[PDB]
Amino acid sequence: AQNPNCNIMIFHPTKEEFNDFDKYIAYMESQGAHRAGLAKIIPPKEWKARETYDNISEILIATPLQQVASGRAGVFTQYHKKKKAMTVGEYRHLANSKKYQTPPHQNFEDLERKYWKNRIYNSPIYGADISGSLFDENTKQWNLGHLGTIQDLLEKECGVVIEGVNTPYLYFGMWKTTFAWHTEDMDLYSINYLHLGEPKTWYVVPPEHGQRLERLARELFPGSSRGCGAFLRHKVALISPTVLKENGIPFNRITQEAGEFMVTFPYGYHAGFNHGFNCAEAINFATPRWIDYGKMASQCSCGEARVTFSMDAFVRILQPERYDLWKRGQD
Ligand SMILES: O=C(O)CNC(=O)C(=O)O
Ligand SMILES: [Mg+2]
Ligand code: NI
Numbered sequence: 001a002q003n004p005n006c007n008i009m010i011f012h013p014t015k016e017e018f019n020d021f022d023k024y025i026a027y028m029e030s031q032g033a034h035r036a037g038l039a040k041i042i043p044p045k046e047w048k049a050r051e052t053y054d055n056i057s058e059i060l061i062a063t064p065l066q067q068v069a070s071g072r073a074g075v076f077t078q079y080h081k082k083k084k085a086m087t088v089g090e091y092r093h094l095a096n097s098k099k100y101q102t103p104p105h106q107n108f109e110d111l112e113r114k115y116w117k118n119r120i121y122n123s124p125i126y127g128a129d130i131s132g133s134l135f136d137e138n139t140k141q142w143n144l145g146h147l148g149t150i151q152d153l154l155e156k157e158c159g160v161v162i163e164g165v166n167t168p169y170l171y172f173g174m175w176k177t178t179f180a181w182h183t184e185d186m187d188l189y190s191i192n193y194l195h196l197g198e199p200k201t202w203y204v205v206p207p208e209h210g211q212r213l214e215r216l217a218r219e220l221f222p223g224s225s226r227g228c229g230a231f232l233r234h235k236v237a238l239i240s241p242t243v244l245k246e247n248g249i250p251f252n253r254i255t256q257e258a259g260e261f262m263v264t265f266p267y268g269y270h271a272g273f274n275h276g277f278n279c280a281e282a283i284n285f286a287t288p289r290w291i292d293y294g295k296m297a298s299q300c301s302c303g304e305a306r307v308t309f310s311m312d313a314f315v316r317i318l319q320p321e322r323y324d325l326w327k328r329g330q331d
């Protein structure tokens, strides 16, 4: 068995190997990369996502989200308070202000210490989930707006044509902006490209040990667990590495820098934080190996998780028994 300790693997494809996206994912899996839940892909030195980032300031962040925490430093939830619209140029200036900027630090490990110690005492503002793309249309390799769609994968594997579309999303972050512990919708893959700015630190639990993380979360968030049998689908709960180590949960960590891709694998729980002003682009995707994970994915039916149009068909075809109850949650 390849990669039996489930370590995060890092890949350095040549320009030739960067042509065929599906083939390279399958290669990474042949080496055991999925066992970690997360992999890093450093693009060939010849590749670029676009020529410059000099003209992005007029993108609108229609609904910036202030991430307000409750709990203790290592075990907390966050809620998202909607703020007034602002442009990317306005948000970058805000991120760089004395109130929100990254503090002085020695290295990534010192910054990580400061994040876990102090996150809860501040409320950073995240421009998340903004439909669009920063890939130049002429970038032909690993262009997250030109991937094969999940609907076409389901049709190729299972023969059933379904409605729905699959487009990328932009994330504009600042110091302390936080992504809570989750897997993807329908336990899909995700791919995330850090276009510019400061790093993003990731934590991940191997897919084979995901249920250990779920059992800890039910113990640590006991009211949320009674409210919903899949409450991590709400994407609000944080648990620190120190707490995970104290409770024997297997995980790994890695820092992504500008110019790098990360891939999350089906049922790979992940969480993390931004180091400073940055912009990332991400999208879900599928491969043939996903189909069995899609069929087994948990679902929130309490009404909190509220998701895309396109998830309807995935539930309806892969999980017909759950469909009725899940759709009640969506309506
Ligand atoms: O970058 C973020 O805030 C969150 N991204 C992801 O969870 C991802 O790409 O799957
Ligand atoms: Mg612009
Ligand atoms: Ni994710």
Ligand SMILES: [Zn+2]
Pocket: 227, 228, 229, 230, 231, 233, 234, 300, 301, 302, 303, 304, 305
């Ligand atoms: Zn729920």
